[PDB]
Design a protein around this nucleic acid. Sequence first.
DNA 1: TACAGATTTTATGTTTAGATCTTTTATGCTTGCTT
DNA 2: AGCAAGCATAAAAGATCTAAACATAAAATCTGTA
Lengths: 130, 291, 438, 425
Amino acid sequence: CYETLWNKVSGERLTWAASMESLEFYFKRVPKNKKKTIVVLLDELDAMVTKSQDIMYNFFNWTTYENAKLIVIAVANTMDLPERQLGNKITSRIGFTRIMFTGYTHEELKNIIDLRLKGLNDSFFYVDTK
Amino acid sequence: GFSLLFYGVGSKRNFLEEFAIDYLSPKIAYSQVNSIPCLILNGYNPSCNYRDVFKEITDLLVPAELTRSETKYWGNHVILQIQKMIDFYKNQPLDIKLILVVHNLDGPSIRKNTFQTMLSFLSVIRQIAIVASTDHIYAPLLWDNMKAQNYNFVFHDISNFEPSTVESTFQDVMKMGKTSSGAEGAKYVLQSLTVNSKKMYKLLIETQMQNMGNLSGPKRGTQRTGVELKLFNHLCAADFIASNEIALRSMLREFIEHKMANITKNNSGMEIIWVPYTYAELEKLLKTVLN
Amino acid sequence: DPGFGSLQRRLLQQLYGTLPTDEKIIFTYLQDCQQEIDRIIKQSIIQKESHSVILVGPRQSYKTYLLDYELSLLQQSYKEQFITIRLNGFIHSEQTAINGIATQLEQQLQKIHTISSGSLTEVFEKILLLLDSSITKITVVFIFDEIDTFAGPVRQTLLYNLFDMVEHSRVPVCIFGCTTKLNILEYLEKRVKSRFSQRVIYMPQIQNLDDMVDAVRNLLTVRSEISPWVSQWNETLEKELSDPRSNLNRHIRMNFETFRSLPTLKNSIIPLVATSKNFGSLCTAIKSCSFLDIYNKNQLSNNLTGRLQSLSDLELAILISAARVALRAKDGSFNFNLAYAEYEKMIKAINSRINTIKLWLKKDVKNVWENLVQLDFFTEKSAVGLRDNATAAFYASNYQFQGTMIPFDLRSYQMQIILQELRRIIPKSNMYYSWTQL
Amino acid sequence: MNVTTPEVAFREYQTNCLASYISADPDITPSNLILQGYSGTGKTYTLKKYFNANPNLHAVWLEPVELVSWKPLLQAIARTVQYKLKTLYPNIPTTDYDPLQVEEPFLLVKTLHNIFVQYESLQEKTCLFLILDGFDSLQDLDAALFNKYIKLNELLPKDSKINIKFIYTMLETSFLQRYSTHCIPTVMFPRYNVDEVSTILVMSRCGELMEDSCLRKRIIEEQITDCTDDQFQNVAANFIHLIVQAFHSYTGNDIFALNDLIDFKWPKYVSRITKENIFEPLALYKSAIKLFLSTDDNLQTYDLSIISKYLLIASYICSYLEPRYDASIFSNPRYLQPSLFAIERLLAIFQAIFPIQSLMKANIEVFQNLSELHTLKLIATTMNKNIDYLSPKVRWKVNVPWEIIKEISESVHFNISDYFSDIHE
DNA sequence: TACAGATTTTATGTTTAGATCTTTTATGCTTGCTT
DNA sequence: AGCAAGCATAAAAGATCTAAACATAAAATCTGTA
Ligand SMILES: Nc1ncnc2c1ncn2[C@@H]1O[C@H](COP(=O)(O)OP(=O)(O)OP(O)(O)=S)[C@@H](O)[C@H]1O
Ligand SMILES: Nc1ncnc2c1ncn2[C@@H]1O[C@H](COP(=O)(O)OP(=O)(O)OP(O)(O)=S)[C@@H](O)[C@H]1O
Ligand SMILES: [Mg+2]
Ligand SMILES: [Mg+2]
């Protein structure tokens, strides 16, 4: 997670620990006059935090720094993963913006399929019989 | 070249300490300026490990480093090094360089065959004097012919009916032993500590039980369920316990030395702090002393 | 004559299936699913459409056979429009599959026209960059055998990434996964299930005897005029398959009832045609099928009955005594002492009822005990034969079992053949037949 | 066929199947072939004879029993395949691939592919056979290695001019039956009969026995004159027949055990030969009956102290006799595993049975002897790696048979049989 | 002052020592009973 | 005093696992000094 992100924000290729320290310094210490906003999408956050849970804490903590302009968009399958991995105190400290994606209803799913076939349903074609 | 063994009813800790430090070391020093260093082994401690003891012995008396040919194929670097010490000290003047004092040689963690073999091999060296004490009544069952030959004991009976308050510190007396856990000694340490150290230990225990609950009662604490030192530094800074990592390490040195918390490096290269006590013991520590 | 040699070679390469793909034979009972396999592949290599299919079927169900025949058929006319990466779950690991994919991609791309250099992170990143991004795109066809071994319960990242390539990549990818599990869908994690297209093809099964008869006719009919004996061989084979009373039809029916698998039948038949020296001997062997009986007898020559029929008098007596003491015991267990006590009781009674059977001593019966244990007539009381994994075998090797600590006399054993089975097998004229009925 | 079948003595079907499956044409030979059978069933002998009769078949013999684990097996395969290929075709310029780089089955596949792609200069496709003599004999063996080796041939190139064909000679049928759905062609080797073993033994050992040095010295020492070519061969054949008919029940249909017995008993049999008994086999047999009456396959049991001997006696009595000592004594149940007890009971029984001086207390010496007894594994505990003798939960048990403890008891003139005769003799 | 050569950093591999767990048989306790 | 049957349960054997000790190695980085 770190090796990628640092490489995506610095062009440097460092190890994972060196990348973690570099990201900590970059977010906490570098002034906001010499930075660009970063929008990180942590797709399948379930797989990242499975052994040491430090990826979640590091990525959510960097959004608490005043100098850091990081914006983390975390995607996971369980609605209470941070409350378990981090704990209630840490999660309350971070202050997420929590959103739940409920499964589609039959009407919404039908509308999705219909929009997927808007120009093709009840349409006309020229077919070469040969 | 006779190792001394003291048995009886009561606490021989005061006897052994006074004999070694106050009498034996100055007398050997004058008969051979500095006094002979004494390595006081506290065998009643359930957290006594032979790795640390041999590291202390190596620090006190520097041996020749174990060579590539002498390490063998995954050989025990402690036993091979001790045999190297024996060979080195076999042909050398028979002075005394160390006086290792073994309190309660039959204690919960000092009675095991590995550390007994370590002491047996160290007893061959005539340049270190061994003054050990035993409390268990079946203690001679520990040593076969080889170990009883390497020790070369001269048994002395010193019965004094002493209270043995220090030995009983490491396990609860009200429970009547209902031994090798070592959490009671940790709690006894926890009454007498700085408030900042107590808060840091409480935070470490809380986060470790959070990790254990995430993972899964009677399971011990290992590095699998433990905090990273960077994450722990961040938590302590958030709670103002430690200003920087240097101060946090300075505080953690006391807990590591007392075998209360362990910092070990995992496969990823992270260094993890873990308390080797079970969930119930940690809960008892938080409820009783850390409340 | 060279004509019979050519005919025999043609028959053997028809049985082995190594004849040219222009004339490879497809059994009628599996001519249907092939079409599906023919469709999907031709919708991915010709029409450039991604596909994710799982072929479920037992061992030797013609999954790899059909999947390779179709690739060979598409190979001769669309050689440069696709590449093939083959993975096997047995010999590939989670870390090792990335290296396998990278090496196969580089090899096939040089062949048609690096990725395999660096650490595992770099290799995986490069293969993701290449795949999971007049002129068209080369179709990547994954022949991914034993998909169930890479669909474990701890983590499925290879399957996740491959199915995500199937959906959200601009390069057409076809992923065929062969497995034997009928519940392969429930093995996948829910993200992988959602990413998988739920296109499971269940390989056809032989539900009729006529299916195997037609399969054998296809296997043993030479449809190319290469030998003077081809017409007469076809006539003989057809007249031996038409009549239901023939020996070949009888053996086909027995295979249908017991095994129901063409590979077993062709394994039985290959030495039948390889052993024959001239055409007349081949015709007689296919008319009588004596070698099929010989092969079947040989295959059953190392099991419990065959091993039991190769025991000396002392070993048989010790085995019978051990069976008696295991039958008497409530747990079915025993040891050397009890077995020898029963053996000496039996020998004393036999000699008393009487040219006298010798009573061997303990030192002369220890070897017999070890020999009977070697043939797995006895096992330890609670022993695991072979661990499923390499890690389990390593852990078992590290552990020092209590059975080896105790002395040889007191080791507790347990049999594989019970006394009733010994009574059934042993002939009534044996000296110990009265002692196999407790 | 162009394949010549060797005339193996008692393997005619097996040789025919070998010639049917193992052929120089890669199109009509199976990818995997299995030879099954037990020890002494002549499978390696049959395969060696078949390959020697056909010098045009390339074979790479391998012995998995020397290669304990799977990594040495893969490395040895990678080394030997390229070594053999270099031997057959020394004119093909090739680059050396280190066999030690093979650390995974896929690495073996890649190395084999790299070795085979540099031999495309050959005119016709060839197949070299990797014979794995004793795939069942791997010490670190699981149920998944053979699954890898079965499908190893699929990932290698199909159109290569060098084809790899595996041949396995496994030992146990229980292992083979795990892979019965793979439909691998298999050749079974049933164990020999008594007649087959006797014929094999005579045809394999008579020539060596008749030329042995001991017979050479004996014939000249006894001043005998006879037909050297035939009479000595008949003598050796008769000796082998006597050995077989005397020890077949003890050894079974095992060629190796009977070979060892022949090697042990031939010098003693030839030392009993003289002028009169050589011509008549009956007299020679009667003059050497003691050889054929006892197998003689064996090559004061302990020097323990009196304290250690009495400790063992007390431990045996304590373990194999129920705690009913309170009623009468001290003022077979031995066919089963020894029971468990405590240290105090052992010490009490030791004091009870120890001869008076007026009673023997538990000194340091008694405990040292007991700990030594545990060290020599004569007495065990419920130990698991770490062991603490002082734990109250540790219980002891005996590890000596009845004969050893009987000898020890009779050494110190103790009647343990009288103590144990109450339940049964 | 750029350097080779020594050291550290990061990254897995090999093996031993120690742990918790399920699974299954031994075991003290209780109940009922006669010497 | 002496013991059979039923029960619960502490315990032995071993599967399954972790992790410290023992070990190797390529890339980067410290370190002398000509
Ligand atoms: N490429 C091939 N060409 C010709 N015959 C083949 C080929 N691959 C396998 N066979 C034969 O086809 C028969 C069974 O088909 P297989 O594809 O090997 O079985 P299967 O469906 O792969 O079972 P698996 O893969 O072990 S689960 C056997 O007689 C094989 O020898
Ligand atoms: N048919 C035979 N004719 C002559 N000698 C034979 C025959 N079969 C076996 N032997 C001999 O008996 C011995 C058998 O050796 P192997 O064939 O190596 O046994 P094996 O079947 O390989 O069993 P293992 O598993 O290798 S110990 C050798 O000394 C052979 O020379
Ligand atoms: Mg397949
Ligand atoms: Mg062999």
